[PDB]
Every structure is written in structure tokens, then in C-alpha cells.
């Protein structure tokens, strides 16, 4: 009968719907690519090459930049989240790092599916450290930030590796606090918090 005509809060009770886009392209092993025509960082990075045709379609869908891409493998049934650099293949070519191919469980010439997904940026991410040497760095936090920049999308199930000074480090997202059931975390700038927790009970003797 009577209405207060007043609204209080209600924002918390609102759930944001992620953005999902699907694309199909053929992937090729970047490893076979000549070093001269390829970048070393790209080989160990999480950036992939896609056609401009897909990007144009995304704009129509009003996808905010940066754009996130997700890889789907029918053969393994597992889907990893890959990052995107720039579109240079007019015909429609997809390139991925050698390590990524192993995770996807697909061999050269295999089809690769890329879907655009947008996440509200997780709040907490748990990363698995490797070797005490990694934690021996004066500014380990800085290294982490660099890794996030390299990878547009981060998945708990996906294992990301960073190569520094010719060295490769394995970082595994054991557990993260997400805002969606997708169980995917992607931090563009720095809205994601990372913590290092030593899961290895082995100790290496000091050499002197």
C-alpha cells in the first residue's frame, strides 16, 4: 500500500556475468619456427598470435581490452587459458609455446580453439614455488608481477613457467579465490594478490 521510495545498497546482491566468445583457428608449433623469425621470450611466454578477423568480431561484441583467450582441447578434454599479444595472421594462424603444447596434449597440426573470456579479476592467488633459489631473489615480488604481465589469463589448473637469464621456473596456481565458478583468474594491471608457499620438504646442502 505504501512505498518508501528509497533504495539501500543492493550492489552486493548483484552478480556480474562474464564475457564469453568462441573462435576456431589452426595452431602451429612455435618451436619449429626459426629463431631469427621468432622471439625467444615468445617461446617461453604466454602470448599467442591470432588473425585480425577475430579481433574485429570481438570489437562488435564490445569486448574491453586487453582481450583474454582460452584454449580448448577436444582430444584431451582439458582447456587451458592462454594470453594474446597481437594479430598478424590475416589468413588465420595460431601460435603457442612449446610447453603449452605439452599441457594441451596436442601434437603439431592439431586444431586449437580460442575463446574470449572476461573475469572480474580474482582477489587471492596461491602460487607454488620451485627451488629455494627462486625465493633467494632480493625482490621475488617483482618477478611475480612480470609473470602476470606476460600471461593475460591465469588458471588454477594451468601451470605457468617463467624464463629469466636463461633459467626456467615452474609456477603452479594451487588455489585462488575467484568471484565465479569458472575457477579462472586474470589480472591485467595488479588487482590480483600472489603469495609464495614452500610446498617442498626437501633441503639442498650449501656448496662452498
Coordinates of C-alpha atoms in Angstrom, one line a residue:
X1 CA 0.0 0.0 0.0
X2 CA 2.8 2.4 0.9
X3 CA 6.3 2.6 -0.7
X4 CA 9.3 4.1 1.0
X5 CA 10.7 5.0 -2.4
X6 CA 14.2 4.5 -1.1
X7 CA 16.9 2.0 -2.1
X8 CA 19.8 0.9 0.2
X9 CA 22.8 -1.0 -1.1
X10 CA 21.8 -3.9 -3.2
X11 CA 25.1 -3.9 -5.0
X12 CA 26.5 -7.0 -3.2
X13 CA 23.4 -9.0 -4.2
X14 CA 24.2 -8.2 -7.8
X15 CA 26.2 -10.9 -9.8
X16 CA 28.3 -9.9 -12.8
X17 CA 28.1 -12.1 -15.9
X18 CA 31.5 -12.9 -17.5
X19 CA 32.0 -12.3 -21.2
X20 CA 32.3 -15.5 -23.4
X21 CA 33.4 -15.6 -27.0
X22 CA 34.2 -18.6 -29.1
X23 CA 36.7 -18.8 -32.0
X24 CA 38.2 -21.6 -34.1
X25 CA 41.7 -21.5 -35.6
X26 CA 44.6 -23.8 -36.5
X27 CA 47.6 -23.8 -34.2
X28 CA 51.2 -24.4 -35.2
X29 CA 54.3 -25.3 -33.1
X30 CA 56.2 -22.1 -32.5
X31 CA 59.2 -24.3 -31.6
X32 CA 59.6 -25.3 -35.3
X33 CA 59.7 -21.6 -36.2
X34 CA 63.2 -20.3 -37.0
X35 CA 64.8 -18.4 -34.1
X36 CA 65.6 -15.4 -36.4
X37 CA 62.0 -15.1 -37.3
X38 CA 60.8 -15.7 -33.8
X39 CA 61.3 -14.1 -30.4
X40 CA 62.9 -16.1 -27.5
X41 CA 60.5 -14.5 -25.0
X42 CA 57.5 -15.6 -27.1
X43 CA 58.7 -19.2 -27.0
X44 CA 58.7 -19.2 -23.2
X45 CA 55.9 -16.6 -22.9
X46 CA 52.2 -17.0 -22.7
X47 CA 51.4 -14.8 -25.7
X48 CA 49.8 -16.3 -28.9
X49 CA 49.3 -15.0 -32.4
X50 CA 45.8 -14.7 -33.8
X51 CA 44.1 -13.3 -37.0
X52 CA 42.8 -9.7 -37.2
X53 CA 39.4 -11.1 -38.4
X54 CA 38.7 -12.5 -34.9
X55 CA 39.7 -9.2 -33.2
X56 CA 37.3 -7.3 -35.4
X57 CA 34.4 -9.5 -34.4
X58 CA 35.3 -9.0 -30.8
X59 CA 35.0 -5.3 -31.1
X60 CA 31.5 -5.7 -32.4
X61 CA 30.8 -7.7 -29.2
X62 CA 32.2 -4.7 -27.2
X63 CA 35.0 -6.6 -25.5
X64 CA 37.1 -4.4 -23.3
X65 CA 40.9 -4.5 -23.8
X66 CA 43.0 -6.3 -23.0
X67 CA 41.3 -9.4 -24.5
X68 CA 41.6 -12.8 -22.9
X69 CA 41.8 -16.0 -24.8
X70 CA 41.0 -19.6 -23.7
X71 CA 42.4 -22.7 -25.4
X72 CA 40.2 -25.8 -25.7
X73 CA 41.4 -29.3 -26.5
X74 CA 38.8 -31.9 -27.5
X75 CA 41.4 -34.7 -27.7
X76 CA 42.4 -34.2 -24.0
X77 CA 39.1 -32.6 -22.9
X78 CA 41.2 -30.1 -20.9
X79 CA 41.0 -26.4 -21.5
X80 CA 43.9 -24.0 -20.7
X81 CA 43.8 -20.2 -20.6
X82 CA 46.3 -18.6 -23.0
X83 CA 47.4 -15.0 -23.4
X84 CA 47.3 -12.9 -26.6
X85 CA 49.9 -10.5 -28.0
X86 CA 48.8 -9.1 -31.4
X87 CA 47.1 -10.2 -34.6
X88 CA 49.4 -10.6 -37.5
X89 CA 47.9 -13.6 -39.4
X90 CA 45.4 -12.4 -42.0
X91 CA 44.7 -16.0 -43.1
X92 CA 44.1 -17.1 -39.6
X93 CA 47.1 -18.7 -37.9
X94 CA 47.5 -19.6 -34.2
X95 CA 50.9 -19.9 -32.5
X96 CA 51.7 -21.3 -29.0
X97 CA 54.8 -22.0 -26.9
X98 CA 56.4 -25.5 -26.8
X99 CA 55.5 -26.0 -23.1
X100 CA 51.8 -25.0 -23.7
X101 CA 51.5 -27.7 -26.4
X102 CA 52.6 -30.4 -23.9
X103 CA 50.0 -29.1 -21.4
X104 CA 47.3 -29.2 -24.1
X105 CA 48.3 -32.7 -25.0
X106 CA 48.1 -31.9 -28.8
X107 CA 50.6 -32.6 -31.5
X108 CA 51.7 -30.3 -34.4
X109 CA 48.9 -29.7 -36.9
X110 CA 46.2 -30.2 -34.2
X111 CA 43.3 -27.8 -34.1
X112 CA 43.3 -25.2 -31.4
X113 CA 40.2 -23.4 -30.0
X114 CA 40.4 -19.8 -28.7
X115 CA 37.6 -18.2 -26.8
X116 CA 37.4 -14.7 -25.3
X117 CA 36.7 -14.7 -21.6
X118 CA 36.5 -11.8 -19.2
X119 CA 36.9 -12.3 -15.4
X120 CA 36.3 -9.8 -12.6
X121 CA 39.9 -10.3 -11.6
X122 CA 40.5 -12.7 -8.7
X123 CA 41.3 -11.4 -5.2
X124 CA 43.7 -14.1 -4.0
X125 CA 46.0 -16.4 -5.9
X126 CA 48.2 -19.2 -4.4
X127 CA 51.4 -20.0 -6.4
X128 CA 53.7 -23.0 -5.9
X129 CA 57.4 -22.0 -5.6
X130 CA 60.2 -24.1 -7.0
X131 CA 63.7 -24.4 -5.5
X132 CA 64.8 -22.1 -2.6
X133 CA 66.9 -20.2 -5.2
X134 CA 63.7 -18.6 -6.6
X135 CA 62.9 -17.3 -3.1
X136 CA 66.5 -16.2 -2.7
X137 CA 65.9 -13.3 -5.0
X138 CA 66.1 -9.9 -3.4
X139 CA 62.8 -8.8 -4.9
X140 CA 60.8 -12.0 -5.6
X141 CA 57.6 -9.9 -5.7
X142 CA 58.8 -8.0 -8.7
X143 CA 59.4 -11.2 -10.6
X144 CA 55.8 -12.3 -9.9
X145 CA 54.5 -9.0 -11.3
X146 CA 56.4 -9.6 -14.5
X147 CA 54.9 -13.1 -14.9
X148 CA 51.4 -11.7 -14.6
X149 CA 52.0 -9.2 -17.4
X150 CA 53.3 -12.0 -19.6
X151 CA 50.2 -14.0 -19.1
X152 CA 46.8 -12.3 -19.8
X153 CA 44.9 -15.2 -18.2
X154 CA 45.8 -17.3 -15.2
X155 CA 44.2 -20.7 -14.4
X156 CA 44.4 -22.7 -11.2
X157 CA 44.8 -25.9 -13.2
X158 CA 47.2 -24.3 -15.7
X159 CA 50.9 -24.3 -14.8
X160 CA 52.9 -21.1 -15.9
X161 CA 56.6 -21.0 -16.3
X162 CA 58.9 -18.0 -16.3
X163 CA 62.3 -17.9 -18.0
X164 CA 64.9 -15.5 -16.5
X165 CA 68.5 -15.2 -17.6
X166 CA 68.2 -18.5 -19.5
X167 CA 66.6 -20.1 -16.4
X168 CA 63.1 -21.6 -16.3
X169 CA 60.9 -21.6 -13.2
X170 CA 57.7 -23.5 -12.6
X171 CA 54.8 -21.7 -11.0
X172 CA 51.6 -23.6 -10.3
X173 CA 48.4 -21.9 -9.2
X174 CA 47.3 -24.4 -6.5
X175 CA 44.4 -22.4 -5.1
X176 CA 42.8 -19.0 -5.8
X177 CA 39.8 -17.1 -4.5
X178 CA 37.6 -16.2 -7.6
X179 CA 34.3 -14.4 -7.9
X180 CA 32.9 -17.0 -10.3
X181 CA 32.5 -20.8 -10.6
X182 CA 34.7 -20.6 -13.7
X183 CA 37.7 -21.0 -11.4
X184 CA 39.7 -18.7 -13.6
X185 CA 41.8 -15.7 -12.6
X186 CA 43.1 -13.0 -14.9
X187 CA 44.8 -9.8 -13.7
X188 CA 45.6 -7.1 -16.2
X189 CA 47.2 -4.5 -14.0
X190 CA 47.7 -5.7 -10.4
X191 CA 44.3 -6.4 -8.9
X192 CA 45.4 -10.0 -8.0
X193 CA 47.4 -10.8 -4.9
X194 CA 50.0 -13.6 -5.1
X195 CA 51.6 -15.4 -2.1
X196 CA 54.5 -17.8 -2.1
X197 CA 54.1 -21.0 0.0
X198 CA 57.0 -23.6 0.1
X199 CA 55.4 -27.0 -0.6
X200 CA 58.7 -28.8 -0.9
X201 CA 60.1 -30.5 2.1
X202 CA 63.5 -31.2 0.6
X203 CA 66.6 -29.2 1.5
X204 CA 69.7 -28.7 -0.6
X205 CA 73.1 -28.6 1.1
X206 CA 75.2 -25.4 0.8
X207 CA 78.2 -25.6 -1.6
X208 CA 81.3 -23.7 -0.5

